Structures are given as C-alpha cells and as structure tokens.
Design a protein around this ligand. Structure first.
Ligand SMILES: CCCCCCCCCCCCCCCCCC(=O)O
Length: 219
C-alpha cells in the first residue's frame, strides 16, 4: 500500500468522512438520549464525550495523510439511518434508538475498524486500535438497556432490525470500491458484523431461531 498516492487519498477522503460523520451523529444521539433520560444523563454524556474523543482521533488520521474528508458524501451516506434514529426519538421509541446506535452502528463500526487495523498506516493503526479497545471496554448503555427490558422490548427490537439492517447492507455496498482501495475485504466486514451482532443479540436474550429470523429480514 502507498498511503500517499492520489488513489489511496481519494478513497480515504470518503472512508474517513464516513467514520467522522458516524462519530458526530453518535455524539449528538447520546446527547439527545441524555436529554430524554435525565436519570441516566451522566452515563450518556460520558458516551457522547468518548465519541468526540474518537472523532478527534480519526480527524488526526486524515491530517496525517493530508486528506480532506468528503463531508457532503458522508452526510448523504448516513441520511436514511440518521432519519430513522431521529424519528424514533421523536416518537419516544427508545427501543429503536438503542438498536440503531448501540447494536447496529456499534457492531458495524467495530467490524470495519477490525478489518482496517491490519491494513492501516501505522499512525491510524494505533489510533484505531485504541478506539476498538475503548468500544470493547466501556459501558454499552443501549445494549444493557435492552437486555434489562428484553421481554417488553423484544418485538420492538425485531421491528427496528427489519427497518434498519437493510440500510447497513446498502451502506456497505455503496463503499465497496473504496474499501477495496484500502485493502479492506467487504466480506470480512460482513462476517465480523454478523458474528458480533449475533453475540450482542444473544446477550440481550435472543435465541438462535430469533437471530436467524432477524438476519432474513436484513435480506
Ligand atoms: C480514519 C478512518 C478509520 C477507517 C475505518 C474503516 C471504515 C470503513 C467504513 C465503515 C463505516 C462505519 C462507521 C460508523 C462510525 C460510528 C460508530 C460508533 O459511533 O461507534
């Protein structure tokens, strides 16, 4: 890999912009949740703050490669998923909010990060390794929220999955050419994303049958 090439920098402008927009939305979304759930505001504001630290880290990765992120691209990339989060929050549908942010986006991001790490330039490797470690180690508020409420929210989780998992797949397909330039295998992202999502859904309380049904809805 030539990290300094026009080709790599062009792809990175879009991939980096996507990660930054994802982190910007995560920060905003955890602040929305903190406003709606004042008893939980300290934990949610700490998650927001962590997202902002990760944003700064990925910004430094772009600066290191002299890449300007393609922000209009990334805003459009996230528009549909972001809209579903904001509409859910508007309806007080915290179940969907948690599924989108704490399960779907979280597993998708960690999958992508894990596929990027072995092919990342050394600076970005170090930064991304710390981001992943942070995600593994810190409180996943939304996962715990859902787990604690499993019997009452399970149908809503299934609805949120059916609405939003297909959007994941479209997003992944949309950047296939750019992930290829970065030497990230799309299929590795798919596999990592699904194994993590199944582990998280199982922790919440879902069975094998249940997770298989949710995967079929993503199709
Ligand atoms: C500097 C760039 C790091 C690149 C890593 C590979 C990225 C490939 C695209 C995958 C997009 C998913 C990003 C969503 C980010 C937000 C996740 C979160 O808030 O936990």
């Amino acid at each position: 890999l030539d990290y300094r090439s026009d080709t790599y920098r062009d792809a990175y402008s879009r991939i980096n912009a996507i990660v930054l927009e994802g982190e910007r939305e995560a920060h905003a979304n955890y602040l929305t949740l903190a406003e709606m759930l004042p008893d939980h505001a300290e934990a949610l504001k700490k998650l927001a703050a962590m997202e902002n630290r990760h944003f700064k880290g990925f910004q430094s990765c772009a600066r290191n490669l002299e890449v300007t992120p393609d922000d209009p691209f990334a805003r459009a990339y996230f528009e549909q998923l972001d809209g579903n989060f904001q509409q859910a929050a508007a309806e007080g549908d915290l179940t969907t909010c948690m599924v989108i942010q704490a399960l779907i986006i979280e597993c998708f991001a960690i999958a992508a990060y894990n596929v990027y790490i072995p092919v990342a330039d050394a600076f970005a490797r170090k930064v991304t390794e710390g981001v992943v470690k942070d995600e593994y180690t810190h409180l996943n508020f939304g996962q715990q929220w859902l787990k604690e409420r499993f019997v009452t929210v399970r149908e809503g989780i299934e609805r949120a999955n059916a609405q939003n998992l297909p959007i994941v797949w479209r997003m992944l397909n949309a950047v296939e050419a750019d992930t290829e330039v970065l030497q990230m295998d799309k299929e590795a992202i798919v596999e990592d994303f699904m194994i993590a999502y199944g582990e998280a859904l199982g922790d919440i309380g879902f069975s094998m049958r249940d997770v298989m049904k949710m995967s079929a809805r993503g199709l």
